[PDB]
Amino acid sequence: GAPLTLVDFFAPWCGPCRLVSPILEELARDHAGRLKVVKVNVDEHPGLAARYGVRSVPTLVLFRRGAPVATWVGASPRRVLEERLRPYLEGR
Residues in contact with its own copies by CB under 8 A are 52-53, 67-74, 80, 83-84, 87
Which residue among 30, 66, 87, 90 contacts Mg ion (CB under 5 A)? 30
Site for Mg ion in 69-88 (CB under 5 A): 82
Whether 90 sits among the annotated catalytic residues: the reply is: no
Report whether 82 belongs to an annotated binding site. Answer: yes
Residues 6+ apart with CB under 8 A from 54: 9, 42, 61
Separation CA 64–CA 79 (nearest Å): 22
Distances in whole angstroms, Cα of residue 89 to Cα of each of 51, 67, 72, 79: 25, 16, 16, 15
Instruction: Give the nearer residue to its own copies in terms of CB position, either 29 or 55.
Output: 55
Separation CA 91–CA 80 (nearest Å): 18
With binding defined as CB under 5 A, does residue 90 bind Mg ion?
Answer: no
Contact 71, 61 (CB under 8 A): yes
Whether 14 sits among the annotated catalytic residues: the reply is: yes
Q: Which of 4, 7, 17, 54 is catalytic?
A: 17
> Which chain residues interact with Mg ion by CB under 5 A?
30, 82
- The residues carrying an active-site annotation are 14, 17
